Amino acid sequence: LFREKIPYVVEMEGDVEGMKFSVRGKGHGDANTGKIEASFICTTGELPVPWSSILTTVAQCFAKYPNDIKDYPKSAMPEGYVQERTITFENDGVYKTRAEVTYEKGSVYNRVTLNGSGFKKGGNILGKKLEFNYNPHCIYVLPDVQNNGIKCYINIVHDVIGGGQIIAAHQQLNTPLGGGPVDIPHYHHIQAHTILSKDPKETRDHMNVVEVFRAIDCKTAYA
Amino acid sequence: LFREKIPYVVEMEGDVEGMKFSVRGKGHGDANTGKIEASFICTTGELPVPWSSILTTVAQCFAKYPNDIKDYPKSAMPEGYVQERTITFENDGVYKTRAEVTYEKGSVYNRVTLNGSGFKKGGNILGKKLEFNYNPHCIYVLPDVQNNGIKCYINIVHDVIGGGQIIAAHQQLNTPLGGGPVDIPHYHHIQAHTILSKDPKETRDHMNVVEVFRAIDCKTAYA
């Protein structure tokens, strides 16, 4: 199912303090390498929040997994899985997100909704004061047998224009869309690395993305 | 002054919901390997909270640093540095801690105070329902030039007796005790690995620790 590089499609609807927007993305994921390359367009005009703020919201199934850690997202495929997050920004509001990640017609689809509230008028998010770049991160993956899934935790470091960084605290739940058996792993990490870029020839508000996700058995590797 | 294995001494005073306690530790740290081995005794009787809950509170200077990342804690030595943390436990209270980490008489000293409040009667902390073990973790180290130091973020995964895990969210600030020059690094990670043990011959409430800390230039290493 993930033996080859395969197409990745994203359909996102957002609403942040009443500002509605749509994002569409197309790219590929290669679970052999853990690499994602995708292009995102805001199809409703100007994105009303920083691109970096929605990077995590816009495919964990593409992560490079070794044989000796259960791969919950790939196990939930092809019927797929629900990915829910609360993202709380330092001194600012929260994104609540609900995604359905499915395998259809040789492609992975990430169809995701986002609501934002509690954001400050001239803060880093509504003021769009975050740099257009990204930092590498460590994703925590924990078993959640009670929910037939995994709970994940991430701190995201956002670089602020003119110096400084803020944290976006991520709480994440992945549960199955199917009725099939799922593989629920022991606690481990996913190393994340992300380069954001623009196409100079692209006139629409956009974000291009090159990502690497590698699962690490930290109980062994950090010893 | 970190070229050799050197002694490590810890003096901790705690107050959680009015329960006062003292912890003393002795061991060594080796910054060549990133290894800490130390023994902790509660000198006031029974520890009123889980040992694992105070593991992070009871020497980042011992972490194994490569040449290409600035080592803030070693740079602050020998006058040393202040380590402040807010630790907020899932569905439970918060530890506020202030440490002074110094080099005196051939030894690293961690003299640290802890206050706990907002804890639930019969919860995982006051009920001591956390397992006597520890998980590996990823420490985020960020520059904080405004404070002549570093800000660090950690999620700690605590295993609960009889199954389950909770998160202890760590916010950490390190500032100098001296007026000397300090080395403030770019954003990077410290991989942490910790094994807890008891001495069968020890009659006092106690915790022995073997730890490995390695700084990783994640901007490069995760690519």
Numbering used by the authors:
A (entry chain B), B (entry chain A): 7 to 64, 68 to 232
Sentences from the study reporting this entry:
In addition to transcripts encoding an FP clearly homologous to A. victoria green fluorescent protein (avGFP), as we expected, the A. cf. australis transcriptome also contains several transcripts encoding other, much more divergent avGFP homologs. Characterization of the recombinant proteins revealed that these avGFP homologs include a green-emitting FP that appears to be the brightest FP discovered to date, 2 long-wavelength-absorbing CPs, and a reversibly photochromic FP. We have identified several new Aequorea FPs with the potential to further diversify the landscape of fluorescent probes and biosensors.
We were surprised to discover a second green-emitting FP in A. cf. australis, AausFP1, that shares only 53% amino acid identity with avGFP. AausFP1 is to our knowledge the brightest FP discovered to date, with a nearly perfect quantum yield (0.97) and a peak extinction coefficient of 170,000 M−1cm−1, making it nearly 5-fold brighter than EGFP on a per-molecule basis. These already extraordinary properties are further bolstered by a low fluorescence pKa (4.4), unusually narrow excitation and emission peaks, and higher photostability than mEGFP (see below). Despite low expression in its native context, wild-type AausFP1 expresses and folds very efficiently in E. coli at 37°C without any modifications. Though brightly fluorescent, AausFP1 is largely insoluble in this context, and when purified, the soluble fraction of the protein runs as a high-molecular-weight aggregate on size exclusion chromatography. X-ray crystallography revealed a uniquely stabilized chromophore environment in AausFP1 that may be responsible for its unique properties. Since AausFP1 crystallizes as a dimer, we speculate that it takes on this oligomeric state in its native context, perhaps stabilized by other interactions. It is possible that, as with other FPs such as dTomato, the dimer interface serves to stabilize the chromophore environment and may contribute to the unusually high brightness of AausFP1. AausFP1 photobleaches at similar rates to mEGFP on both widefield and confocal microscopy when instrument settings are identical, but because AausFP1 emits photons at a higher rate (due to its high quantum yield and extinction coefficient), its true photostability is somewhat higher than that of mEGFP (S1 Text and Figs Z and AA in S1 Text). AausFP1, the brightest fluorescent protein currently known, will serve as the parent of an entirely new lineage of super-bright FP variants.
